[PDB]
Amino acid sequence: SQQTRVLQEKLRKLKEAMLCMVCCEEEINSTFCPCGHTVCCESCAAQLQSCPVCRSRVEHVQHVYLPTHT
Amino acid sequence: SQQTRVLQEKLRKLKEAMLCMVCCEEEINSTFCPCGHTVCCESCAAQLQSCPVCRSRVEHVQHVYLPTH
Numbered sequence A: 001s002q003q004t005r006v007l008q009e010k011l012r013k014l015k016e017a018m019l020c021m022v023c024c025e026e027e028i029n030s031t032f033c034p035c036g037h038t039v040c041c042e043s044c045a046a047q048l049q050s051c052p053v054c055r056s057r058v059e060h061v062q063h064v065y066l067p068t069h070t
Numbered sequence B: 001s002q003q004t005r006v007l008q009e010k011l012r013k014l015k016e017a018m019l020c021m022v023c024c025e026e027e028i029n030s031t032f033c034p035c036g037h038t039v040c041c042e043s044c045a046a047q048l049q050s051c052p053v054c055r056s057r058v059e060h061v062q063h064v065y066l067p068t069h
């Protein structure tokens, strides 16, 4: 039904929000510290000097294990 | 249809996986450092000396800003 199409769209949007903001291909699994923005996969987070969201200096990257990881 | 029920269940499970594993009421927004397990809201994470997933000592809690929030 049309309700099935609405639910498919909600699911797709939630899944796309879990993907890296730089490569759009890999799941987010890394946090820029100390700001806390968690928006990249490990590879894209590795060479950024400043956070791509808030411009704060990246002192280090913390790996995150999330229950939504697939 | 039956597919509407199946999709409602998938959405419910994905939403529940984003909720705190301790209180089941608030969104996950905190990481136990250094282990990296990110399974609690800030209120439950503040009260745990050891990670509830791996039992490693919590040196500190890092707040996480996620796009799904």
Ligand SMILES: CC(=O)Nc1ccc(Nc2ccccc2)cc1
Pocket: A065, A066, A067, A069, B037, B038, B039, B053
């Ligand atoms: C099997 C056992 O004794 N404990 C155990 C170990 C790893 C996970 N993995 C995991 C948890 C939360 C978030 C992302 C991954 C869950 C439970």
Ligand SMILES: [Zn+2]
Pocket: A020, A021, A022, A023, A024, A025, A026, A040, A041, A042, A043, A044, A045
């Ligand atoms: Zn990436």
Ligand SMILES: [Zn+2]
Pocket: A032, A035, A036, A037, A051, A052, A053, A054, A055, A056
């Ligand atoms: Zn930031």
Ligand SMILES: [Zn+2]
Pocket: B020, B021, B022, B023, B024, B025, B026, B040, B041, B042, B043, B044, B045
């Ligand atoms: Zn909680």
Ligand SMILES: [Zn+2]
Pocket: B032, B035, B036, B037, B051, B052, B053, B054, B055, B056
């Ligand atoms: Zn842990």
